[PDB]
Amino acid sequence: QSITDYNYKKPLHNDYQILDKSKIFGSNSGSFVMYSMAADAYYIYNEKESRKRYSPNSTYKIYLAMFGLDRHIINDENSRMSWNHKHYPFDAWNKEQDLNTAMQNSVNWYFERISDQIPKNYTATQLKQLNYGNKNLGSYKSYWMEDSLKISNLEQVIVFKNMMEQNNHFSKKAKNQLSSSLLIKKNEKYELYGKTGTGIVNGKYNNGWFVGYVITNHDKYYFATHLSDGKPSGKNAELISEKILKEMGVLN
Ligand SMILES: *C(=O)[C@@H](NC(=O)c1ccccc1-c1ccccc1C(=O)O)[C@@H]1N[C@@H](C(=O)O)C(C)(C)S1
């Protein structure tokens, strides 16, 4: 909307390292950002592109889940929601959900039902405290889905790291419940947590995301891949993230 709604220009006062992951990105365009907790350092492929703000799409379900937990819309004993019989094109959406199944299968209606219960003033307060991108709530409907609210790839990392790692307003039990819903892979070497997002505009992919974090025995890393062109889907952003993280030594 405004002059600053499409970019993040705040300096990184940290140590940062330029990466070249162009061979992994291939015919896709976008950026990758990682932050290491132990190093207090950022690692960025395509820094210019990492500061452009895009709709977060389904990655904002991270924040809707945290808000839903914070406001006691869902909890640790019961995060179940019944299906209202509206037919969806995916069978995984046509059934009862809890936080885990909704996050895993990116069930939009579950998060929409959460958002409907959240008053605009609370969201505005939270996006301000979190420094969430352009903080633009617009019409306040599905404002995170190809709409007013935009965030950069660099901000996806900073905002998620700060939300989880600072001693703040969100409880440890909420943070733990969200983490459980985001767990993708666990083995002897690492735990990988994350969430995809895919935007579709006029039948074409236009905006792919995979935002998450890795816990190893030595460190914790927050990361995000954004795709703006080529085949810009969440699925592809996840594949790219895994290839990059592997090369960097984060996954062993
Ligand atoms: C998350 O971003 C999300 N996005 C969408 O569903 C979406 C966004 C914009 C336009 C269309 C759609 C969409 C996708 C699938 C089916 C129907 C529709 C629609 O509204 O017509 C949900 N998350 C994605 C992810 O990558 O995790 C998803 C593709 C699983 S769907």
From TrEMBL:
Sites bearing N6-carboxylysine, chain numbering: K61
Q: Which residues form a coiled coil?
A: none
Q: Report domain Penicillin-binding protein transpeptidase positions.
A: 36-245
Its family?
A: Belongs to the peptidase M56 family.
By what name is this protein known? Beta-lactam sensor/signal transducer BlaR1
Q: Which organism is it from?
A: Staphylococcus aureus
Q: What is the lineage of its organism?
A: Bacteria, Bacillati, Bacillota, Bacilli, Bacillales
What's the name of its gene?
Answer: blaR1
- State the covered range within the intact protein: 332 to 583 of 585
